[PDB]
């Protein structure tokens, strides 16, 4: 009973840059440029290389505790990022596993669009709640905005 939440977002930053900074360096940004969304990531070790895990931890006031993500390999030339949320967040209820695939696209006059693919893997019970898909899509849009204005404020970081 998986759900295919194929959504997307828009950013003024070109695809490549948005990737090297908002998708390749979110651990040294999300918290800095977005201390309101992330607090610090812990793991990124070298145990599985392509497909390792990470422990993202938000600041207090969170209804959850943290979130482990699976890089599931990563791209670069075509700006692609196949990762997962697995354990972490509102786990339980009706959402145990979650595989997300992202694909940035550069436009001749539209900056870059982030094609997000939230594949939810719940376990029977009720179906994924769009509202829930929105909360996560909310932290994702806010972060994109953080790394979006971080490149301009700083000296063109990730250039």
- In the chain, what is the straight-line distance between the N-terminal and C-terminal CA atoms, in Å? 42
43 annotated binding-site participant? no
Please choose, from the candidates 36, 49, 30, 16, the residue with its C-alpha nearest in 3D space to the C-alpha of residue 156.
16
Provide the 8-state DSSP code for 127: P
CA nearest 89: which of 116, 56, 113? 56
Domains in the chain (CATH in brackets) are 1-159 (3.30.530.20)
Contact 39, 142 (CB under 8 A): no
Adjacent-strand bridge partners of 83: 100
Determine the distance from the C-alpha atom of residue 29 to the mean position of all C-alpha atoms in its chain, rounded to a whole number. 12
Whether residue 83 is annotated as binding a ligand: the answer is yes
Q: Residue 99 forms beta bridges with which residues? A: 84, 119
Element (H, E) at 67: strand 67-70
- CA 90 centroid distance within chain: 16
Q: Which two tokens stand for residue 41?
A: 């990531």
- 150 marked as binding residue: no
Q: Are 39 and 58 in contact (CB under 8 A)?
A: yes
C-alpha span between 135 and 108 (Å, rounded):
31
Question: Do 95 and 87 form a contact (C-beta atoms < 8 A)?
Answer: no
């Amino acid at each position: 009973g998986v759900f295919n939440y194929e959504t997307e977002t828009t950013s003024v930053i070109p695809a490549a840059r948005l990737f090297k900074a908002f998708i390749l360096d979110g651990d040294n940004l999300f918290p800095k440029v977005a201390p309101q969304a992330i607090s610090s990531v812990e793991n990124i070790e070298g145990n599985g290389g392509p497909g390792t895990i990470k422990k993202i931890s938000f600041p207090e006031g969170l209804p959850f505790k943290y979130v482990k993500d699976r890089v599931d390999e990563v791209d670069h030339t075509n700006f692609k990022y196949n990762y997962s949320v697995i354990e972490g967040g509102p786990i339980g209820d009706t959402l145990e596993k979650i595989s997300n695939e992202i694909k940035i696209v550069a436009t001749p006059d539209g900056g870059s669009i982030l094609k997000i693919s939230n594949k939810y893997h719940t376990k029977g019970d009720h179906e994924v709640k769009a509202e829930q898909v929105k909360a996560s899509k909310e932290m994702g849009e806010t972060l994109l905005r953080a790394v979006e204005s971080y490149l301009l404020a700083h000296s063109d970081a990730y250039n």
